[PDB]
Amino acid sequence: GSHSMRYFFTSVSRPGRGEPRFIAVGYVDDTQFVRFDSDAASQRMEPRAPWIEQEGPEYWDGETRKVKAHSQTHRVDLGTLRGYYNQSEAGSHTVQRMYGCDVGSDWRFLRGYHQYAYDGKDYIALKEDLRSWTAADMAAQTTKHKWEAAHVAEQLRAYLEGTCVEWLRRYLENGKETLQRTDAPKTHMTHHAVSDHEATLRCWALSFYPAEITLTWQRDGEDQTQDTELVETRPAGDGTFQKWAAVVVPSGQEQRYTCHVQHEGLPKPLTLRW
C-alpha cells in the first residue's frame, strides 16, 4: 500500500513557569518511532519503536542536534507571532508544525507537507505544488514574504521529494517486520437487548494494522450510514487498532442486517451475520 513519514511539533508558551514546552514525535504510517520532550532529563531524540533502536550513534547524535535546532526556532517563533498579532506576554500560546511525505505502493513520492498552526488555527502551509504558500492573514503574509525572498520553498521541496522519501524507504526496509506487516482485523458480533422491542448489534474489528478500515452495516443490502453508531478508530496500545459499529435492531429483524469489514489485510471484504 501507500506509506508516510510525518513529524509533529508542539510548542507551548508558559509565561510564568519557565521556558516553552517543546514536544516532537515522528511516525511512519501509524507507528510512532521517535520523540523529544524539552521537559525530559535526556535532552535527546529517543527511540519509541524497536526497529529504530538499531540506528547507530551518528543517527541519534544527528537527530538530537536537529531536534534542538527545531526547538530553538520554535522558541523564537512564539515571540515573533506575539509581535505579529500585537499580543501581550501574559497568555499561553501554541505553535504546531507538521511536515513529511507520502509515497505510493511503488515507494515513489506522492505528496509533501510543511504547515503551521497558531492557537489551533491554520497559519501558513506549503501548497501541493511545493512552490507556493497559503497565508490567510497579514501575519502569515509577512512570513510568506520573508520565505519567498529567501527561497525557502525550494529548500523544503528538495527535502520533501528527496531526503524524506529516501529515509522513509530506509525505515520501511529496516523496520520491515513492524512497518510492512498487515494485521487483518479479528472480528466478532454482540447482541444486547435495550428494551423488549429492540436490541443492539455491535460489529467489532480488533488487533488490526494499519489503522485505515471501513466498518459498515447494511439492512437488506442498503448502507445504514445515518443509523449506525461508529466510534473513532482507537489505539489498543500494543501497536494495533480497534473499531466498532452498532445498529439498533427492532424485534425479529436481526437477519435483515449485515456488517461489512474492509481492510488491507482482508484479501476479500468480510460480510458478518447474527
Binding site: 513529524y7 515522528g26 537527530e63 536537529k66 531536534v67 535546532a69 527545531h70 530553538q72 526556532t73 523564537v76 517563533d77 515573533t80 507571532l81 505579529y84 505553535v95 511536515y99 503551521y116 497559519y123 501558513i124 512570513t143 520573508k146 520565505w147 529567501a150 525557502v152 529548500q155 523544503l156 527535502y159 531526503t163 524524506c164 529515509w167
Partner: peptide, 9 residues
C-alpha cells in the same frame, strides 16, 4: 530523519 535546516516565521 528531520529537516537539517529550520526557517524562522
Amino acid at each position: 530523519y528531520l529537516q537539517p535546516r529550520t526557517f524562522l516565521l
